């Protein structure tokens, strides 16, 4: 613990006196360079003055420079500012920033908590700067040869309503404690920093702040408020049993980026059973083949070790923080790759209920074939049906793994008389030569 | 854990009726509730879901304003009010918990549709219903000209279960459904409340 | 990090000249640098390769002898002298940075060729500039008869960017280059430095 | 711990004396058997003498007996080796082994480190044996029956520059430390030791030790050192998007065996990005989907979850130690496959500065279609063009990963007013009806 | 380990003979023994299995009364007496060794059939033996008209290796077999005892 208290801040009036007094403890405070910076409420930090190490050199900024009296006592290890003949333009939130190095490569590292004090920039940044998630955005700092191009430039991201924290120290380099995403930058006399990617984190003030050895004061940046601005999922994937199969499916940022990702497994006939929960974890009573990983707006479902229990749609579902709705995958039909079986092929000819009924519905089936695709075509003597018949198959055998198929050709009570043979022809992998049985009337 | 869902059945096109839900097993004033559609034969389309009467309440874009969802802790039961009806809409129904309190050791389903009721089924059509004519036949029974969907075919009330495959039913010109059972039948029609033995 | 390469142009055949490549953002004396070619149309030919110029220089079979590489850490610069340039070193050259140090726990592109900068563009020919030729035809316009490759061109100063699709330049029996960009058109040619805007 | 520290030795001449003392720690000192063993700068390990329990029953090698003597210390449980009257043959390193197991069956365990004294074997093991990777390797000791067939077996790996390390123990048996790899073996008077599959770590040198109740000594075995014996890549690779993709690319040993491989990603018109630096790790800024593993001599790219964004040039470089050179990959193209679009066709008749200017460049375009392969013919009145008009193909769209290709037909100005129609016929998968604009003059 | 077997070679059917499995290298007395019958090309066929002299003996059901196992822990052998022999029985058989003792830490083939011995080779016919026939063809030569099966052929004695592929023998009318080696031929026949260096 490096940590920085602060007090002595409070309501006070125009021309007045204010005693502020920080305390550091958890590292030798008097070794370090200290300094009081000052942040106007909804405006950029304004460096208001520094104490060396020994509490020799003082260094005040000249909007404030002759009134106030940086001083520093080593042996109850605090520092205080003594603000005599207040103006209206100090109000605002006081801090005393550690500092790591010397001067003039001056590090605010470590930041008080802020006290309330009642009562221009040199560095020309911008006043703001717009990204977009997963962006590269280049918020660049401005100075003279005396700021950015001959000392060190360090970039602050001060998040809203709490004190600044260091990112960039020594124009390249990054404490411990910041992600690589953010990298310094100097050329000349002009600096920046580059963010790869943004999150929502990264909505904050980013200021530069350099010293300058012919003004003598640590000038900071100005603002530059950086404002960020269906799971798609494969129709049927499979695979042989024993495999791995990954179904992969992905979103948006608002539908999985952002937001847990889960995996339903729902059998046919039955409701859908959650198999994944957490963009990794995985309830009890599920076994643990049945893995999920999801990377950035990829969310992966491993099934290892098919089986005939396996089959089923495989969904992905994950709230929209946009939508404001727990938007479902597309749904993957995963079957398993059986060895191609033998259709075994009947037929029925209709009864004489059909008879009595008024209608003729003549069925042809197809048992315990793989896979999916078959057909079936009514030839009745040599004749094609003219798009009459209707068929449905079954899903995969929850345990033989094969297909059932029913072809039901419905035709008029008179028009089962007007014919005599009535015959279905099946066209499938497994039976190169047809099979068909040909019943008569 | 249990949800229990009632009032699925015919419906007038523009009709209105009500969704219960019953809900036992958990306590459920601790778990936010939601309602998803599944059209027959197709993909879970989410209704909508709730935890709080007065919190926001979150409807899907096709059913924002026409259904109103509400709770009720005192008797265990989340409530659905479909008014205005739409064709598409004729789908099941299905009643889920949706965990939204995550507890420190106890990890559970925290923000996933944990438990699922067994749903039911909603007809948004103008036809009436029609009692299932049942025909016997791999000894098979076809059940045909039955409205609506669905109809409980089974061989020997249960009694014979190996090799009992049954196909999904089809919409027929004249819209009136049709199943057969392959291996007497018990055919049971809940909308038209016939159960008929073949 | 940024390496920017200068000294990209016409040159006649047999001919000398430096490229200039400044280097900002990392220690220079720290990181072995190289030179690659990269054919217009064609893979990258590594040109060659320095560390410390009492160091031994590498350099590409092709180029044994003609090519002199160079640093300057004070300016953190890398030099090529490239002298009796060959027809097929007509080409883009890249200035890349290859880390040849790694620290313990940093781990960065060791013996990668790490960053690249934009590369110049070589042509060694005794033909002469041409200026561009700008004809307005999906609005689209051609820019026929330019020499050399590359001209920047863009539809309403880049305002207008999407759907602007440039395909390659061609080689005509003229020798000449030609494109177009398909949807005002400002079409900026460098080596003959012309501006015009149609 | 049972280490066992020992020193007593430097520089000495010929004829003197010399006292060598190895202290035992972390075990019952006085309880154990010990021994003195020695090893001559680059020879084989020669059993000095060794000392029991009790220190009552002294052994000593024919080579050194009557000029050394083994003493033993268990009150301040150190053990001492008294040499007196050394020879030219006495400059070696010197260890103390304990003894695990009662004498005949000897077993050396814990050996010291090595004291540097400066001033024939028994068992015919062999001089070496070469092996190679994944091989196995029988290293056979051979000795008389009172050697390898009544004592028991034991086999010390002693990799170079180090203490030996027990192996096998009791002709059969390993300690708790040596994978079961090693197999001890033993019949009749010749034993044997067989490594089934060798790494990097089986380079040492592997001694054969056995008591001798005739000897009475504990001949050791005769070293045996056991030794271990551009960059083509695919032109263009494919893959829907979702897909993994796998570029694999292979030099030789000099090119990417033995080099760090890289791969780089060079999007169209821009410069390459390195994706992958080391044999598998991937730079920061880069999404994790971009993995990398060298397998011999083979590098594998494998592009997860591929998107517009993905399709690029994709480079595998390795350094090159004979050609002194970062040989490079042939560059893979990389494209996504998009369901085939429909090309929209437009023709320009040339423009009328065409004729002012003496030339008729007629362009004819085809927007927004898959795949690459497409063919324009300039039916110019049913006519076609003979080598003249030239065209070429836009790269994968970067959002619509879509092609676009532009024919111009450059003819004489002469040519444009001797003829009255010009049109151009397009082939593709997506529009199997040809689509032609025909314009007049 | 090592299981030699002794006994294989020429018998009249119905005869008698006796497998001798001499086993060094472990002990003898605390695993299982077994022998294994394997068909000139086909599958392994279980003879018999044995722990105890006074235990239970187990036999193959097609084997049951012909066959008699037996040990001898003093001379660590195992023994085989095979009697009435039938023709389907013409083999080799494998002395394997069936460890059914684990220990705690020692993981060793429990109940696995660890170690197998080189295995003997049994024929049950009555022909009479006759001395192989070299006959030279890539160079080659044919070994025909030996009886029985096996006969160890080689290039050079076995100096020249690489190449010398052998095919396996086959059946002829006059039930005489035959090998050709492929890259001096060395064919040795032990059941008839003769080498011939062609």
């Known amino acids: 613990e490096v940590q920085v208290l602060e007090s002595g801040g409070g309501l006070v009036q125009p021309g007045g006196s204010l005693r502020l007094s920080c305390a550091a403890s958890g590292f030798t405070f008097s070794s370090y360079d200290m300094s009081w910076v000052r942040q106007a409420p909804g405006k950029g930090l304004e460096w208001v003055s520094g104490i060396s190490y020994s509490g020799g050199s003082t260094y005040y900024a000249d909007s404030v420079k002759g009134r106030f009296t940086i001083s520093r006592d080593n042996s109850k290890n605090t520092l205080y500012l003594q603000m005599n003949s207040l103006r209206a333009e100090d109000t605002a939130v006081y801090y005393c920033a550690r500092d790591v190095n010397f001067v003039p490569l001056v590090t605010f590292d470590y930041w008080g908590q802020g006290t309330l004090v009642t009562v221009q920039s040199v560095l020309t940044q911008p006043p703001s700067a717009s990204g977009t998630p997963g962006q590269r955005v280049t918020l660049s700092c401005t100075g003279s040869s005396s700021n950015i191009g001959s000392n060190s430039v360090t970039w602050y991201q001060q998040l809203p309503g709490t004190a600044p924290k260091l990112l960039i120290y020594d124009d390249n380099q990054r404490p411990s404690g910041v992600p690589d995403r953010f990298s310094g930058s100097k050329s000349g006399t002009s600096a920046s920093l580059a963010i790869s990617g943004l999150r929502s984190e990264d909505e904050a003030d980013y200021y530069c702040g350099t010293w300058d050895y012919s003004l003598s004061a640590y000038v900071f940046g100005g603002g530059t408020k950086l404002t960020v601005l269906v799971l798609t999922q494969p129709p049927s994937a499979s695979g042989t049993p024993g495999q791995r199969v990954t179904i992969s499916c992905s979103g948006s940022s608002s539908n999985i980026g952002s937001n847990a990702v889960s995996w339903y497994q729902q059998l046919p006939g039955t409701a859908p059973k959650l198999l994944i929960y957490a963009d990794n974890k995985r309830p009890s009573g599920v076994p643990d083949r049945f893995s999920g990983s999801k990377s950035g707006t990829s969310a992966s479902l491993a099934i290892s070790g098919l089986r005939s229990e396996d089959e089923a749609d495989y969904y992905c579902?994950?709230?929209?923080?946009?939508?404001?709705?727990?938007?479902f995958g597309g749904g993957t039909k995963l079957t398993v790759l059986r060895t191609v079986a033998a259709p075994s092929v009947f037929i029925f000819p209709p009864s004489d209920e059909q008879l009595k009924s008024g209608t003729a519905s003549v069925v042809c089936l197809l048992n315990n074939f793989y896979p999916r695709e078959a057909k079936v075509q009514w030839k009745v003597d040599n004749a094609l049906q003219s798009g009459n018949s209707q068929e449905s198959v079954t899903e995969q055998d929850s345990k033989d793994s094969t297909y059932s198929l029913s072809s039901t050709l419905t035709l008029s009570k008179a028009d089962y008389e007007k014919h005599k043979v009535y015959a279905c022809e099946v066209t499938h992998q497994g039976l190169s030569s047809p099979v068909t049985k040909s019943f008569n009337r | 854990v249990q949800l229990l869902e009632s009032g699925g059945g015919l419906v007038q096109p523009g009709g209105s009726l009500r969704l219960s839900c019953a809900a036992s097993?958990?306590?459920?004033?601790?778990?936010?509730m939601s309602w998803v559609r599944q059209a027959p034969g197709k993909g879970l389309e989410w209704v909508s879901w709730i935890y709080s009467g007065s919190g926001n309440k979150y409807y899907a874009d096709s059913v924002k304003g026409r259904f109103t969802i509400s709770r009720d802790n005192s008797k265990n039961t989340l409530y659905l009010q479909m008014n205005s009806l739409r064709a598409e809409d004729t789908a099941v129904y299905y009643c889920?918990?949706?965990?939204?309190?995550?507890?420190?050791?106890?990890?559970?389903?925290?923000?996933?549709?944990?438990?699922w009721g067994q749903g039911t089924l909603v007809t948004v059509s103008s036809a009436s219903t029609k009692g299932p004519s049942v025909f016997p036949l791999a000894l098979g029974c076809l059940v045909k000209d039955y409205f609506p969907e669905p109809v409980t075919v089974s061989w020997n009330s249960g009694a014979l279960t190996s090799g009992v495959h049954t196909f999904p039913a089809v919409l027929q010109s004249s819209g009136l459904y049709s199943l057969s059972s392959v291996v007497t039948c018990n055919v049971d029609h809940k909308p038209s409340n016939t159960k008929v033995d073949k | 990090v940024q390496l920017l390469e200068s000294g990209g142009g016409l040159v006649q055949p047999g001919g000398s000249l430096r490229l200039s490549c400044?280097?900002?953002?990392?220690?220079?004396?720290?990181?072995?640098?190289?030179?690659v070619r990269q054919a217009p149309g064609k893979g990258l030919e590594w040109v060659s390769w320095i560390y410390s110029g009492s160091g031994n220089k590498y350099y590409a079979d092709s180029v044994k002898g003609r090519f002199t590489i160079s640093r300057d850490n004070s300016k953190n610069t890398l030099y090529l002298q490239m002298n009796s340039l060959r027809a097929e070193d007509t080409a883009v050259?890249?200035?890349?940075?290859?880390?040849?140090?790694?620290?313990?726990?940093?781990?960065?592109?060791?013996?990668?060729?790490?960053?690249?900068?934009?590369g110049t563009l070589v042509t060694v020919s005794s033909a002469s500039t041409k200026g561009p030729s700008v004809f307005p035809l999906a609005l689209g316009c051609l820019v026929k008869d330019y020499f050399p490759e590359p001209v920047t061109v863009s539809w309403n100063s880049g305002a207008l960017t999407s759907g602007v699709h440039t395909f390659p330049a061609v080689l005509q029996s003229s020798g000449l280059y030609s494109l177009s960009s398909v949807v005002t058109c400002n079409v900026d040619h460098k080596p003959s430095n012309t501006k015009v805007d149609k | 711990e049972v280490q066992v520290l020992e020193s007593g030795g430097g520089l000495v001449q010929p004829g003197g004396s010399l006292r060598l003392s190895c202290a035992a720690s972390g075990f019952t000192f006085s309880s154990y058997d010990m021994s003195w063993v020695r090893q001559a700068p680059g020879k084989g390990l020669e059993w000095v003498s060794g000392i029991s329990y009790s220190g009552g029953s002294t052994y000593y090698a024919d080579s050194v007996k009557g000029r050394f003597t083994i003493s033993r210390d268990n009150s301040k449980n150190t053990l001492y080796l008294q040499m007196n009257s050394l020879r030219a043959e006495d400059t070696a390193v010197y260890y103390c082994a304990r003894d695990v197991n009662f004498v005949p069956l000897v077993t050396f365990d814990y050996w010291g480190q090595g004291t540097l004294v400066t001033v024939q074997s028994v068992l015919t093991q062999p001089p070496s044996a070469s092996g190679t990777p994944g091989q196995r390797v029988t290293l056979s000791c051979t000795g008389s029956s009172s050697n390898i067939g009544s004592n028991s077996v034991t086999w010390y790996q002693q990799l170079p520059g180090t203490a030996p390390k027990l192996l096998i123990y009791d002709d059969n048996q390993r300690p708790s430390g040596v994978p079961d790899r090693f197999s001890g073996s033993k019949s009749g008077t010749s034993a044997s030791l067989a490594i089934s599959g060798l790494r990097s770590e089986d380079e040492a040198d592997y001694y054969c030790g056995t008591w001798d109740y005739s000897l009475s000594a504990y001949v050791f075995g005769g070293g045996t050192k056991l030794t271990v014996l551009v960059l083509t890549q695919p032109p263009s690779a494919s893959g829907t998007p979702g897909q993994r993709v796998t570029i694999s690319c292979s030099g030789s040993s000099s090119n990417i065996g033995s080099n760090a491989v890289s791969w780089y990603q060079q999007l169209p018109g821009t410069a390459p990005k390195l994706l992958i630096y080391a044999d598998n790790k991937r730079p920061s800024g880069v999404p994790d989907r971009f993995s990398g593993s060298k397998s011999g001599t083979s590098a594998s790219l494998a592009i997860s979850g591929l998107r517009s964004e993905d399709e690029a040039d994709?480079?595998?470089?390795?350094?090159?130690?004979?050609?002194?050179?970062?040989?490079?990959?042939?560059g893979t193209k990389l494209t996504v496959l998009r369901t085939v679009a429909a090309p929209s066709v437009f023709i320009f008749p040339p423009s009328d500065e065409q004729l002012k200017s003496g030339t008729a460049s007629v362009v004819c375009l085809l927007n927004n279609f898959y795949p690459r392969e497409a063919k324009v013919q300039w039916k110019v009145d049913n006519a076609l063009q003979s080598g003249n008009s030239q065209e070429s193909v836009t790269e994968q769209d970067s959002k619509d990963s879509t092609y676009s290709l532009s024919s111009t037909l450059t003819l004489s100005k002469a040519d444009y007013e001797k003829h009255k129609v010009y049109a151009c016929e397009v082939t593709h998968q997506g529009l199997s009806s040809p689509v032609t604009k025909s314009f007049n003059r | 380990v090592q299981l030699l077997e002794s006994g294989g070679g020429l018998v009249q059917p119905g005869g008698s003979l006796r497998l001798s499995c001499?086993?060094?290298?472990?002990?003898?007395?605390?695993?299982?023994?077994?022998?294994v019958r394997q068909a000139p090309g086909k599958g392994l066929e279980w003879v018999s299995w044995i722990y105890s002299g006074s235990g239970n003996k187990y036999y193959a059901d097609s084997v049951k009364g012909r066959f008699t196992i037996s040990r001898d822990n003093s001379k660590n052998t195992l023994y085989l007496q095979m009697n009435s022999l039938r023709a389907e029985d013409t083999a080799v058989?494998?002395?394997?060794?069936?460890?059914?003792?684990?220990?705690?830490?020692?993981?060793?083939?429990?109940?696995?059939?660890?170690?197998?011995?080189?295995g003997t080779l049994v024929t049950v016919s009555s022909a009479s033996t006759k001395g192989p026939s070299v006959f030279p063809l890539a160079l080659g030569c044919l070994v025909k008209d030996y009886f029985p099966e096996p006969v160890t052929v080689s290039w050079n004695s076995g100096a020249l290796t690489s190449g010398v592929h052998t095919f396996p023998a086959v059946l002829q009318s006059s039930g005489l077999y035959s090998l050709s080696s492929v890259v001096t031929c060395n064919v040795d026949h032990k059941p008839s005892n003769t080498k011939v260096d062609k």
């Open positions: 889920a918990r949706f965990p939204i309190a995550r507890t420190s050791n106890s990890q559970s389903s925290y923000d996933g549709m944990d438990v």
């Open positions: 097993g958990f306590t459920f004033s601790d778990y936010a």
């Open positions: 579902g994950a709230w929209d923080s946009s939508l404001n709705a727990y938007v």
